Amino acid sequence: RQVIVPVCMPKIHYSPLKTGLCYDVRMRYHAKIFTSYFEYIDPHPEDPRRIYRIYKILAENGLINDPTLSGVDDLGDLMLKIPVRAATSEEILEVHTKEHLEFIESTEKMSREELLKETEKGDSVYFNNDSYASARLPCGGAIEACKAVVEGRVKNSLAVVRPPGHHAEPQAAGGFCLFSNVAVAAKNILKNYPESVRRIMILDWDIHHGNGTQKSFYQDDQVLYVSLHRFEMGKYYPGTIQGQYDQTGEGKGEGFNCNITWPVGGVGDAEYMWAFEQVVMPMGREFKPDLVIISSGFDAADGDTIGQCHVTPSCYGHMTHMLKSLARGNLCVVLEGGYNLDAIARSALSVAKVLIGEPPDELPDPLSDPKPEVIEMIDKVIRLQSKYWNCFRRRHANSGPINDSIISKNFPLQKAIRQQQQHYLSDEFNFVTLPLVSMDLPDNTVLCTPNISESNTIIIVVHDTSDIWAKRNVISGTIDLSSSVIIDNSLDFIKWGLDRKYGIIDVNIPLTLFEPDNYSGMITSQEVLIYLWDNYIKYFPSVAKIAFIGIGDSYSGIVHLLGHRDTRAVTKTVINFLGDKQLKPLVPLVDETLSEWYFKNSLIFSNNSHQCWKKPRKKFGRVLRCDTDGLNNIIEERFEEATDFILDSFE
Amino acid sequence: ENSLSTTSKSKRQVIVPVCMPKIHYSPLKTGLCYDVRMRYHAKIFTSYFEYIDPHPEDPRRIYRIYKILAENGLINDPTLSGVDDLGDLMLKIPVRAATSEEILEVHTKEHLEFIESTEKMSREELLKETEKGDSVYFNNDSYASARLPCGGAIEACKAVVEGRVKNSLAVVRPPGHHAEPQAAGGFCLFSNVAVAAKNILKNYPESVRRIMILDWDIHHGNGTQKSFYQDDQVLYVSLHRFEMGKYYPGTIQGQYDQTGEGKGEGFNCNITWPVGGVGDAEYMWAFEQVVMPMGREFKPDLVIISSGFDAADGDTIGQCHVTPSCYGHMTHMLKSLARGNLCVVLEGGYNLDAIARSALSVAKVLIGEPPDELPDPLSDPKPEVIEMIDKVIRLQSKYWNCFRRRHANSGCNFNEPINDSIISKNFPLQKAIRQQQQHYLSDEFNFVTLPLVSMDLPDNTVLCTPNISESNTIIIVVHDTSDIWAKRNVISGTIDLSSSVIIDNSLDFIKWGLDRKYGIIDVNIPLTLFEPDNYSGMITSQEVLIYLWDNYIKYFPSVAKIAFIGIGDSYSGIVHLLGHRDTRAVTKTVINFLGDKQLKPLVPLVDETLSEWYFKNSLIFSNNSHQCKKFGRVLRCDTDLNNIIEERFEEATDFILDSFE
Ligand SMILES: [Zn+2]
Ligand SMILES: [Zn+2]
């Protein structure tokens, strides 16, 4: 009965609120006019049916009570309409040149054949008689959304809005894009309110390049322009030089542009997730945007006809949640592109429930293990932004190619590898160096098991040098060279051949320098292979069941033992961990029957992202695609399949 | 006005009927537990009336932050008791006792009867178990109201796994992160978090099997660390100070390298801060480093949130400056990582005000909001934080897939026991450098080693010249691991050996000293060698410097004119030893190529003309993209580091030979 508080009003800031949308029944009208029949077997590259499917997949999934799938003013208690009207033109010429807009103003009064001319002249464009308000209304809607965004009239806004804008360059467009929507929006919110709107991040992953949006703020500092697109400089549309990684901005805008390109289609989730969490979040702190305008486009998802990717809806909903986090609910998610109607619905169904306020779902594939163009793509981007920004300086030992002539005095980098190998394989497994003299190689490099003569079953392993893993430090620059580990990739099959007590011969090959294919290493592999079989092994009478095991390089010397010598009177099946190296096919020389025998009992293992697989001959002879990348990965991993295969080939 | 004006003069037929919508997070509201019966049990005071200071475990801290949430309109009840009716935005949790079958799953029975005995012990024995069982307060009423912290720790969670609440909290006293079966400590009566976290899986192993545990109370959750130590189902994360024993608890089990034990390995992740005073920068760094990718790679079914704001911006024991907006952002970004399978539990925060604003921010994130953004976005952590997090995501590739191939780790694998054995196929390359330069300088110039006998390292680490005793003039070239330059194969962390140019820049000073025919101790710093793993090569390299100077160098017959070439961070202990020992009559000079390394803090011990004698005796050269009186003639150079080594090598040897005239 002693009182400390009364009944009082609860005090929050976000979520009593409703999700604003941008949708129109008149945006469907700008369409392509009948010229060819190939356009039917084309995916209708900007089809107008990208809207309503998404507007189906949210309304019939419970998020909108609607009996009509059109406009009734009772929108429930989670969705807002944004009323878009016919806009004016000075907002458009914040970006555009004026006679670009007079070219668009003409199209209200042009006849048909003149648009067939100007679609022959426009760089993959399309027009219609009904394109005048469809040029203006996405831009005026992009302003009318963003005004509700940065004040916080909506808690979040999203635009299921066609046509796209990101190919509408100021002089003359090209790329199906009438006027730029987001660039007009981002100019006019800075120049209507530089009190609320102080800095804008524009991000895009519509996988055609935003050349209509880049040059609008290529000079500007207040827009951090992050773009994500396939480059493919002439082939895929468009390949500008504005899409390239060197475009860090201009003048005051230097560092306020960030291009991310994609060299191949068919990529997945943690490509975008891992790339997103590397670049998008720290500079999305340090840049301090108020609003990030978020540019979707369905040329890039799972099931797209052109992008052909593997990217889940869930990946999109997780980046929806973290850019909900990165802004303060200053969210304008906009849509640009799309070919398919089936990528769009699963992705919109994931993302719009995040923008109601649910967390996104757990990952259907949490293991993309992303494709290595994404891994080596963003590194030079971090180099130029670390030339401009604090948020990747010293976080990756960055600090904001200079000499090539110090080569003649150098720590020779391969001697103590094979000396160290020689000492532990000389004590633990006690390898006789049996030297192949009257040749050229260092001495302790051919290490055999003793009594190799009476040892019938001989396992030979030739390899390169050891693999060298390293740690590079993070505080200042260079590579922490102690924590370089020396991956001796030959130990386990040596332990298998001494587990079964075979004649083990190991040959290391010193590599060739600065060279794509390790060619003189292949030359001395033919010298080794021809010298061993033409000097001592026919003069071993007590011999059967030989297998050759090549790691990495120099397969063509053992190919030269097959196609140039009858070594298969004693040997049975050759093993190659090729991996990333170039294909060494067996040339058909005496016949193609020994190549057919090669095609029946041999093993070659190569990578996923190696030369092929983007079918081949029988003279390659059962080369096996591997998705666990590295020589070390298949040497530890398919130990067991190797010792089942060659003991299938033996007794 | 317009053109189209579509004619729909019809009864437009209904597509989807009257239905309840498919939303599946937040139609319901956050649960809150509160009872006055936790506000009872206290301490017995002896010397003076010690109600001047509130104790860090206190009956009013719950009512403090409960009053902070009473300020913000959430509670209609005037009494501020535990009742259910509050408005429409939260919901209250009831509490039954933890029964002895619910708490004796983990606990010894002696613990339960001992609490039941100190329920009725005498006041002298309340002081005796206060002094005997360390750091646990006692008073003559325990078991009638100690049943309820663990009891609510059970019974809040069954609303979560049923789906009667999105996610919730547990404001609770006493804590539970320093309590074991056989013992306790740390103001803990029972472990409220282990008897929060077992019971959901034991009473329901039909919806939840794997649980992740957050802990950022900067006292390490030590009693619960052993409670799930072999439990492979339960992944655990704790963030805490280490201090080598001195912060509480301060053990070897509060160390970053405890991955787990038995089958529970890879389910235990510790984070040690080597120095406090951290802010939002290191938490939003580390929170996106390890938590998010393995939290997507693992995907638990429930997350227990051990919450402690003893490192908050305003709190005194954790001494740190982490603002409430950081706590709100770490609240906000873990909704996505599970489905929302979250429950906060109160663990730490002993200033009355930092826990108030911090839990005020966590409350108005998880009642449905994003937090306020970070007020310093050019935030810039301590570099040793990122160094220790590099050593965190070092050994992650021996288990986890998300931390290899993206963070350049897939070539190595640390399930290889990293040694010159065969089961290691990974071999340390600083021994290959030193075996190569050992073999190389012995077939070149017959070069010998030292032992570090009585020093905890391996033997072939450090070298010297043959007959250093009659070497009357001694150069000491001090070096860290050298510097190679290649393309960055950034999938694996392996390199291309063909594109890689290693300079042994110190060897040029060695051969230049062979144009002087003078003595050399080739001192090497591998950066800790990673094998004792608790290790800082700074201080142990200073122990080597003590070991050389105070065991060998002064006691030499013709000793004179001693030169000292430290290289970068391997000049830092020369800041120590020259600071700590008087060498000034026998030193002619002391050389540094810093480059882009940091400056090293001057620690003098013998006289204050060390800085001026060292200012005479030093040529120090630093890099140009480095952009950099008592640190002794630090010359920034022009042409680059190895261009300024060929630019300033002549400068250094000309200063040495003009010290020789
Ligand atoms: Zn587009
Ligand atoms: Zn604490």
Side-chain angles (χ1 to χ4, degrees):
Chain A
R1 299 291 294 165
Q2 57 184 355
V3 55
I4 187 54
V5 285
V7 187
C8 44
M9 175 51 169
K11 313 172 175 183
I12 61 166
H13 68 269
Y14 207 89
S15 56
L17 298 174
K18 298 155 75 160
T19 290
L21 278 300
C22 320
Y23 150 86
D24 180 18
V25 306
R26 299 188 305 171
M27 280 188 308
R28 66 197 172 187
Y29 282 81
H30 166 65
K32 201 176 177 69
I33 311 173
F34 173 62
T35 77
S36 159
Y37 79 100
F38 283 160
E39 304 158 350
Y40 306 119
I41 204 54
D42 295 343
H44 193 170
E46 207 287 326
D47 55 349
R49 293 212 311 153
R50 277 153 44 201
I51 293 175
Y52 88 105
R53 295 298 293 263
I54 284 162
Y55 180 69
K56 218 156 179 182
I57 207 65
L58 301 174
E60 308 175 353
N61 275 90
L63 309 189
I64 302 87
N65 263 7
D66 57 324
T68 70
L69 272 180
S70 52
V72 186
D73 52 278
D74 315 277
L75 275 78
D77 220 329
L78 287 172
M79 315 284 134
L80 312 178
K81 46 198 161 161
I82 305 172
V84 182
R85 293 182 183 174
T88 78
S89 43
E90 55 278 17
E91 307 93 30
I92 311 187
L93 317 174
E94 300 311 324
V95 186
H96 267 310
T97 67
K98 188 183 183 179
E99 295 78 3
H100 182 83
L101 170 148
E102 305 305 326
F103 190 22
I104 302 312
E105 177 78 4
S106 86
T107 304
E108 175 62 28
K109 299 94 174 152
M110 298 176 92
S111 76
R112 175 183 177 102
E113 186 41 76
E114 319 159 18
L115 324 176
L116 316 182
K117 297 320 293 160
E118 305 304 323
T119 43
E120 184 276 332
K121 303 151 181 194
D123 170 34
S124 68
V125 307
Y126 72 102
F127 300 101
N128 189 241
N129 281 322
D130 305 81
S131 314
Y132 182 33
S134 279
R136 299 223 317 266
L137 198 160
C139 313
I143 300 164
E144 274 288 319
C146 275
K147 257 61 169 187
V149 174
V150 190
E151 303 158 359
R153 297 270 55 67
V154 302
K155 73 182 189 294
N156 47 17
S157 176
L158 192 148
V160 302
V161 158
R162 83 178 272 274
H166 72 95
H167 285 300
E169 287 188 354
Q171 305 85 14
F176 319 100
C177 279
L178 308 196
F179 291 145
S180 188
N181 316 315
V182 50
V184 164
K187 238 134 185 179
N188 294 273
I189 52 187
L190 289 170
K191 312 325 170 286
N192 278 278
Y193 309 86
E195 298 304 323
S196 62
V197 196
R198 316 205 59 76
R199 272 154 311 286
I200 319 171
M201 200 168 168
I202 290 175
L203 191 141
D204 168 82
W205 66 99
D206 174 287
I207 208 154
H208 295 89
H209 168 240
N211 50 357
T213 58
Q214 174 156 323
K215 181 269 198 191
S216 162
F217 306 104
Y218 190 71
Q219 58 291 318
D220 194 333
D221 66 333
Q222 280 196 297
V223 178
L224 179 68
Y225 176 86
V226 191
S227 88
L228 287 76
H229 44 64
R230 300 166 65 168
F231 188 74
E232 318 188 9
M233 174 56 183
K235 292 74 52 187
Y236 178 70
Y237 190 79
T240 75
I241 202 161
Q242 289 70 5
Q244 195 168 345
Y245 82 111
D246 55 358
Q247 299 291 107
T248 66
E250 190 273 349
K252 76 178 191 179
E254 283 287 2
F256 301 99
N257 189 323
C258 204
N259 282 328
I260 300 159
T261 75
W262 302 121
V264 66
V267 298
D269 301 331
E271 290 67 9
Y272 275 99
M273 293 306 301
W274 162 254
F276 170 79
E277 293 175 352
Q278 288 297 111
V279 59
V280 175
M281 325 312 298
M283 171 190 286
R285 299 193 284 259
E286 157 158 321
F287 168 72
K288 320 154 295 307
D290 318 333
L291 154 67
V292 187
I293 314 176
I294 289 173
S295 176
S296 319
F298 287 116
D299 51 353
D302 203 14
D304 179 73
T305 68
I306 310 301
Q308 314 152 318
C309 309
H310 318 290
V311 185
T312 60
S314 75
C315 171
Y316 300 144
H318 280 283
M319 307 172 295
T320 310
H321 193 98
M322 312 201 179
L323 302 187
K324 178 161 38 167
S325 80
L326 188 49
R328 214 201 315 99
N330 282 317
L331 298 171
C332 206
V333 182
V334 298
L335 181 48
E336 292 288 81
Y339 294 92
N340 185 2
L341 304 193
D342 303 333
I344 75 172
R346 81 175 90 99
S347 316
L349 181 51
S350 56
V351 162
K353 317 187 159 188
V354 192
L355 271 197
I356 298 178
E358 281 72 0
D361 299 329
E362 296 180 357
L363 266 77
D365 203 331
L367 293 91
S368 176
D369 282 327
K371 299 144 193 73
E373 318 83 344
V374 190
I375 299 172
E376 266 90 1
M377 156 65 49
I378 309 174
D379 284 288
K380 309 158 55 190
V381 184
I382 303 189
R383 294 291 160 76
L384 315 184
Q385 307 286 352
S386 274
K387 163 176 180 174
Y388 285 108
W389 290 75
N390 188 12
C391 55
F392 303 100
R393 281 188 284 258
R394 183 164 274 265
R395 318 208 180 172
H396 322 74
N398 279 8
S399 52
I402 54 169
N403 190 290
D404 293 327
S405 45
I406 60 153
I407 308 300
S408 87
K409 262 193 174 194
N410 202 320
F411 213 81
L413 183 146
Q414 308 297 8
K415 181 65 214 75
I417 290 186
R418 179 70 166 171
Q419 188 73 29
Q420 175 61 40
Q421 284 224 60
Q422 159 207 1
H423 262 168
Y424 59 74
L425 294 166
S426 171
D427 308 332
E428 307 322 299
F429 313 114
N430 200 264
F431 281 164
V432 166
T433 294
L434 217 51
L436 314 179
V437 70
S438 314
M439 285 181 69
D440 69 84
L441 181 71
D443 174 51
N444 55 5
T445 306
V446 184
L447 263 65
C448 84
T449 36
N451 302 164
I452 181 60
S453 278
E454 57 79 33
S455 86
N456 315 103
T457 307
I458 302 171
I459 288 301
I460 310 167
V461 184
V462 77
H463 67 290
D464 49 356
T465 187
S466 74
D467 288 4
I468 305 300
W469 190 98
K471 149 198 183 178
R472 185 188 83 95
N473 69 18
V474 78
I475 182 167
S476 314
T478 194
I479 314 158
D480 193 76
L481 187 57
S482 178
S483 57
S484 317
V485 308
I486 296 173
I487 305 183
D488 192 3
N489 276 314
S490 66
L491 285 160
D492 51 348
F493 294 98
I494 273 180
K495 286 182 295 186
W496 168 86
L498 291 163
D499 173 66
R500 299 180 60 84
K501 183 63 178 67
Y502 293 159
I504 286 278
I505 311 165
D506 198 341
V507 174
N508 173 291
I509 280 191
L511 306 155
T512 77
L513 167 57
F514 266 121
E515 194 164 280
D517 72 84
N518 196 40
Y519 165 69
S520 159
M522 309 157 200
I523 300 309
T524 181
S525 76
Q526 299 99 33
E527 303 181 353
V528 166
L529 265 291
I530 292 314
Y531 172 83
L532 57 84
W533 165 248
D534 298 352
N535 277 66
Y536 313 97
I537 295 179
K538 324 153 160 184
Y539 312 102
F540 300 154
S542 88
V543 66
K545 314 184 173 173
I546 305 187
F548 316 116
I549 298 174
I551 298 176
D553 57 352
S554 66
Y555 182 39
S556 49
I558 306 167
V559 170
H560 197 281
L561 201 57
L562 306 186
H564 298 73
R565 281 287 184 197
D566 182 59
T567 182
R568 57 174 173 167
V570 54
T571 192
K572 298 180 184 297
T573 296
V574 65
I575 296 182
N576 182 9
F577 314 97
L578 191 85
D580 65 325
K581 325 293 187 176
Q582 187 173 355
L583 305 177
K584 316 301 167 199
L586 187 65
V587 57
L589 273 191
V590 306
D591 206 305
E592 63 185 342
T593 303
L594 188 148
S595 84
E596 199 69 24
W597 168 84
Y598 171 91
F599 174 85
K600 298 333 291 161
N601 51 283
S602 159
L603 282 181
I604 301 95
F605 321 119
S606 184
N607 278 2
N608 194 346
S609 307
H610 166 274
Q611 309 158 353
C612 299
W613 307 281
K614 293 144 195 157
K615 305 285 190 175
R617 292 203 212 175
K618 292 182 292 297
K619 65 156 192 171
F620 306 128
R622 201 180 301 173
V623 179
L624 304 183
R625 176 182 181 177
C626 316
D627 64 352
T628 65
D629 311 323
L631 289 172
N632 190 16
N633 284 30
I634 57 178
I635 279 162
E636 319 169 330
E637 165 183 352
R638 321 206 83 75
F639 186 90
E640 185 44 78
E641 182 179 339
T643 183
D644 295 329
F645 195 108
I646 185 55
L647 297 185
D648 166 273
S649 163
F650 306 146
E651 298 292 328
Chain B
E1 185 257 6
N2 218 241
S3 180
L4 317 168
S5 301
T6 158
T7 75
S8 298
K9 313 178 181 181
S10 88
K11 177 55 70 183
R12 308 162 54 83
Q13 54 270 12
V14 169
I15 310 171
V16 296
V18 54
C19 65
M20 219 58 227
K22 185 64 178 67
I23 65 167
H24 50 281
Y25 205 75
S26 313
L28 292 175
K29 296 328 290 160
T30 312
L32 205 173
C33 61
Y34 180 83
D35 181 15
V36 63
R37 295 190 275 166
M38 271 189 311
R39 315 193 30 188
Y40 296 177
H41 183 42
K43 212 176 180 321
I44 302 295
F45 301 150
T46 66
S47 160
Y48 66 98
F49 309 99
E50 293 180 352
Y51 295 83
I52 305 183
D53 46 348
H55 184 74
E57 207 287 332
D58 179 284
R60 300 176 302 277
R61 305 171 33 201
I62 291 187
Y63 185 76
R64 271 299 330 287
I65 315 156
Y66 182 80
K67 195 166 195 158
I68 291 306
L69 303 193
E71 293 160 7
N72 300 258
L74 317 176
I75 304 89
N76 303 340
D77 165 59
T79 75
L80 277 189
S81 196
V83 308
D84 198 1
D85 183 284
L86 64 86
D88 45 13
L89 310 181
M90 289 184 183
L91 175 46
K92 207 251 187 170
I93 314 166
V95 173
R96 196 269 310 283
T99 81
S100 288
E101 69 259 42
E102 290 158 352
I103 210 170
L104 273 174
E105 284 142 358
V106 51
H107 276 296
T108 79
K109 280 61 189 151
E110 153 194 7
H111 189 78
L112 260 289
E113 308 147 14
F114 188 80
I115 294 301
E116 217 153 348
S117 70
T118 194
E119 170 60 22
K120 59 183 176 65
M121 267 189 190
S122 79
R123 205 177 189 278
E124 182 45 46
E125 308 170 25
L126 293 163
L127 301 181
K128 274 168 174 195
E129 311 308 334
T130 288
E131 68 91 28
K132 249 163 186 175
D134 50 329
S135 84
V136 170
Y137 65 100
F138 292 97
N139 191 6
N140 216 320
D141 189 30
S142 296
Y143 198 61
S145 278
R147 50 186 62 186
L148 321 169
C150 279
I154 306 145
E155 284 142 1
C157 297
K158 316 318 182 220
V160 170
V161 287
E162 193 38 59
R164 312 203 303 283
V165 53
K166 329 157 293 186
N167 47 2
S168 91
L169 58 95
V171 63
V172 60
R173 71 169 289 272
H177 54 91
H178 299 291
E180 286 192 359
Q182 84 295 345
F187 313 146
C188 288
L189 266 57
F190 313 114
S191 181
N192 301 322
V193 55
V195 191
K198 290 273 192 216
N199 60 71
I200 326 161
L201 184 147
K202 315 309 173 286
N203 298 117
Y204 292 96
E206 65 253 39
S207 281
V208 173
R209 187 256 160 174
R210 282 212 146 167
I211 294 175
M212 202 294 308
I213 320 297
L214 194 39
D215 181 6
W216 76 81
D217 186 353
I218 205 163
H219 311 84
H220 157 226
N222 200 1
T224 319
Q225 169 264 326
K226 206 180 305 300
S227 158
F228 299 86
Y229 192 28
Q230 289 56 34
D231 195 332
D232 61 338
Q233 312 167 354
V234 196
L235 168 57
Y236 173 52
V237 176
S238 162
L239 293 88
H240 56 93
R241 296 166 74 181
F242 171 73
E243 295 200 352
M244 188 62 206
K246 310 303 179 293
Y247 199 58
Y248 181 78
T251 172
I252 199 171
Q253 298 301 108
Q255 204 167 6
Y256 75 106
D257 55 71
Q258 314 293 103
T259 181
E261 211 280 338
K263 53 153 190 61
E265 295 194 29
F267 302 103
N268 187 1
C269 319
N270 313 359
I271 291 88
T272 78
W273 319 92
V275 59
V278 313
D280 304 344
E282 314 80 335
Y283 274 85
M284 300 296 292
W285 165 242
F287 172 69
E288 300 293 316
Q289 282 299 304
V290 189
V291 173
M292 316 314 302
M294 197 164 63
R296 265 169 322 279
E297 191 71 17
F298 176 78
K299 287 322 202 154
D301 318 328
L302 206 63
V303 172
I304 307 317
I305 316 167
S306 156
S307 59
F309 314 117
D310 67 336
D313 198 358
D315 207 329
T316 81
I317 321 184
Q319 306 163 358
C320 277
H321 321 291
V322 179
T323 71
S325 88
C326 194
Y327 293 126
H329 270 280
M330 297 174 309
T331 312
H332 187 72
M333 301 170 181
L334 304 171
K335 310 169 186 264
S336 88
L337 207 60
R339 205 176 181 183
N341 309 118
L342 302 173
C343 51
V344 181
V345 58
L346 174 60
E347 306 281 23
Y350 315 109
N351 169 29
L352 286 186
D353 305 331
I355 195 174
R357 308 171 272 90
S358 313
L360 184 51
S361 49
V362 188
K364 314 184 169 189
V365 179
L366 70 85
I367 206 72
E369 291 75 13
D372 195 89
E373 293 153 324
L374 272 80
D376 60 298
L378 300 93
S379 315
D380 306 292
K382 328 175 180 182
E384 56 274 15
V385 173
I386 305 104
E387 286 179 2
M388 292 323 108
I389 285 171
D390 164 37
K391 303 153 57 182
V392 166
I393 310 155
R394 182 76 61 83
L395 311 182
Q396 279 290 328
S397 89
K398 98 165 174 193
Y399 293 162
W400 287 93
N401 172 73
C402 83
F403 290 137
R404 47 193 155 197
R405 175 170 159 85
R406 259 149 293 170
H407 311 74
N409 306 320
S410 302
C412 70
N413 164 58
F414 300 103
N415 306 293
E416 283 84 274
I418 305 93
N419 190 357
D420 277 330
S421 87
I422 313 286
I423 305 307
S424 45
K425 67 190 318 167
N426 305 116
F427 291 89
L429 178 146
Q430 170 86 336
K431 317 297 173 175
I433 298 173
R434 195 86 153 162
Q435 280 283 2
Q436 199 281 344
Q437 190 168 1
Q438 180 187 25
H439 271 163
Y440 179 79
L441 292 188
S442 46
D443 58 45
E444 275 289 328
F445 308 109
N446 264 7
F447 202 62
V448 308
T449 184
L450 302 90
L452 42 85
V453 52
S454 66
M455 189 43 221
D456 186 327
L457 299 167
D459 204 311
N460 48 4
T461 294
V462 58
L463 310 188
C464 79
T465 174
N467 192 207
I468 189 63
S469 297
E470 292 277 326
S471 81
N472 64 327
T473 299
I474 296 194
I475 323 175
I476 302 195
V477 178
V478 197
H479 79 276
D480 184 18
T481 79
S482 184
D483 53 299
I484 205 166
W485 297 302
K487 57 157 286 299
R488 177 167 185 170
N489 179 4
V490 75
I491 309 107
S492 68
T494 59
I495 67 169
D496 199 324
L497 278 182
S498 88
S499 65
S500 88
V501 182
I502 181 62
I503 185 64
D504 186 355
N505 49 5
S506 47
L507 182 50
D508 318 335
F509 299 93
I510 305 186
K511 66 203 68 180
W512 156 77
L514 318 182
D515 313 282
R516 331 302 318 156
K517 283 320 301 174
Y518 287 160
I520 181 54
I521 297 185
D522 191 11
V523 288
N524 189 327
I525 293 89
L527 281 195
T528 69
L529 297 88
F530 189 71
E531 180 185 2
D533 188 90
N534 62 325
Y535 208 94
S536 173
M538 216 78 73
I539 300 94
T540 67
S541 58
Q542 304 166 325
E543 297 174 357
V544 182
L545 284 152
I546 298 298
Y547 186 69
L548 298 183
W549 181 258
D550 301 306
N551 290 64
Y552 306 106
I553 298 171
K554 197 174 165 28
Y555 321 98
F556 280 177
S558 59
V559 73
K561 279 197 308 195
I562 294 181
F564 292 93
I565 313 181
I567 299 168
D569 45 357
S570 69
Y571 188 76
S572 196
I574 312 183
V575 171
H576 163 263
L577 186 73
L578 297 186
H580 294 52
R581 307 283 173 275
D582 164 79
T583 73
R584 312 167 289 98
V586 75
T587 306
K588 264 206 162 178
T589 183
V590 52
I591 317 290
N592 176 36
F593 268 105
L594 190 61
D596 55 355
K597 285 286 189 176
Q598 74 270 15
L599 275 298
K600 320 296 185 161
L602 167 66
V603 280
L605 268 285
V606 304
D607 53 40
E608 210 49 46
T609 174
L610 276 171
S611 174
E612 281 57 38
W613 154 84
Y614 149 74
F615 182 82
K616 175 50 205 72
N617 288 15
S618 277
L619 257 58
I620 297 186
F621 314 114
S622 315
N623 216 34
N624 215 349
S625 171
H626 188 195
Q627 215 260 344
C628 295
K629 186 268 180 186
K630 63 173 185 175
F631 294 157
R633 308 194 275 141
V634 190
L635 311 182
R636 189 202 201 188
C637 192
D638 181 28
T639 55
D640 196 14
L641 168 73
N642 282 105
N643 292 280
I644 90 170
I645 307 188
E646 55 87 16
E647 211 283 339
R648 284 303 163 77
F649 193 117
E650 195 270 350
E651 185 42 59
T653 175
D654 196 1
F655 174 75
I656 286 178
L657 64 88
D658 287 352
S659 297
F660 271 56
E661 176 189 5

